[PDB]
Every structure is written in structure tokens, then in C-alpha cells.
């Protein structure tokens, strides 16, 4: 109902520098797969780093202050950005650090991308308690030519 989506890298490693320390093409696929026509919700940092409005979805960008383009939709806290989403039946909120942390506990699924990189950074996806979450879905992907990393596709239940 609310959902996480992140892809982690060793340590929980998610970002360096306001980038993604890996290119995973078929990554990006999966996120893109699991997020169309669903509301998304990120931090202005995560607005920053992706650049311009992901399409098919409505982007809610989380900020204390004024927002700074109306291709997409600003909130200045957790409770008006889960309003702003609208009447529906899942919302994907796609980070950064501190938008996980604080989406966490209201959260009934994740979607996590187990990357097998070692990444130097500055952001993480929360350590979250395990007890709480039962595996339901896991695809391992070897490295191949386009990705330069095996990966695994998780989805997390809250029990
Ligand atoms: N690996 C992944 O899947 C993944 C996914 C997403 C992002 N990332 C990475 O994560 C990094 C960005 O994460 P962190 O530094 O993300 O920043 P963030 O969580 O994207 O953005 C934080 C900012 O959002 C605003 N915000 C957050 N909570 C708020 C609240 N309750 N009320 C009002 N404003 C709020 C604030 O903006 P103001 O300062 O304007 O108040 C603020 O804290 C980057 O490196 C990015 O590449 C990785
Ligand atoms: N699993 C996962 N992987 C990520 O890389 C990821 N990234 C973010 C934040 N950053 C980004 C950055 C770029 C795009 C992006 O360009 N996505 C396209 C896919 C098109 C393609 O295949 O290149 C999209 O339309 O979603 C999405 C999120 C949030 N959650 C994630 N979750």
C-alpha cells in the first residue's frame, strides 16, 4: 500500500556524490516496470539527481520550501505527500536516504535490488529490522554484457 523501491550495493550503499555508483540497465527496468502508473514520491535531492520528471507517473517532490517547477507536484512533509498521491492502491516513494528512513515504518512492501558492487558512498537505504519482512519474490541475475554486476530482485512483505 506504501512501498519502498531502492537498489543497494554492499553496506546498504545506495548513492555517492547524489549519484548512483553503478549502471544497470536491467535495473532500471525493473524499477521502471514496477513504478509506471503509480504515484512516486522523492526528496529534492533524488529530484535533483534524476534530472527532469520520470514519465507515466506523477512525481511528488518532498521540500521545506517552495518548489522550483510545476511539471511535477511539491509537499512539505510525509502526511501531505501520502495525501497528495491521491485515493490509490500503491504508492512507490523511490528515495533518497532520508525519504526511506521516514517512509519505512508506514511501509507494507519493499522492493529491493541486491547489487553485488562495492561502492564507496554517502547514502543509505535504512537498516531496517529483518524480523519484520518475509521474502515473497527473489530473482538472481548473473553479470552480462550490458550489466556489469549480478544483481538480485527482492520483494519484501511486512508479516
Ligand atoms: N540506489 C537507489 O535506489 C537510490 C534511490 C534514490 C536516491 N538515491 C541516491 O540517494 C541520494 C539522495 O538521498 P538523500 O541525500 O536522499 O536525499 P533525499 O532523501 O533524496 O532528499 C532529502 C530532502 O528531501 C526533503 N525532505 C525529506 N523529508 C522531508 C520532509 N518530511 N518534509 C519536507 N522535506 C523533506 C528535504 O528537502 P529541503 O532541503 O528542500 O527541505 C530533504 O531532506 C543520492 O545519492 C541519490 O543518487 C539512490
Ligand atoms: N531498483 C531501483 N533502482 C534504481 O536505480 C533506483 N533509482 C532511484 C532514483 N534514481 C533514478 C534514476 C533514474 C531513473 C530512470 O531513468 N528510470 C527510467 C528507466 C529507463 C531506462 O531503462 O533507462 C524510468 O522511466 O523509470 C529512475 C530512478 C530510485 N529507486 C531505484 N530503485
Sequence with gaps: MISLIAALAVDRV?????????????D?????????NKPVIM????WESIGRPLPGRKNIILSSQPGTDDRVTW?????????????????????????????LPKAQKLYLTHIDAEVE?????????????????????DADAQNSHSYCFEILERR
Excluded at 14 to 26: V, Y
Excluded at 28 to 36: D, G, I, P, V
Design 43 to 46: 526528496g529534492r535531492h533524488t
Design 28 to 36: 532500471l527496468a525493473w524499477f521502471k516496470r514496477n513504478t509506471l
Design 75 to 103: 509537499v512539505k512533509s510525509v502526511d501531505e505527500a501520502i495525501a497528495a498521491c491521491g485515493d490509490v492502491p500503491e504508492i512507490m516513494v523511490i528515495g533518497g536516504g532520508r525519504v526511506y528512513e521516514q517512509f
Design 121 to 141: 558512498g554517502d547514502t543509505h537505504f535504512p537498516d531496517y529490522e529483518p524480523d519484520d519482512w518475509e521474502s515473497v519474490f527473489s530473482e538472481f541475475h
Design 14 to 26: 545506495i548513492g555517492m556524490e547524489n549519484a548512483m555508483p553503478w549502471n544497470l540497465p536491467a
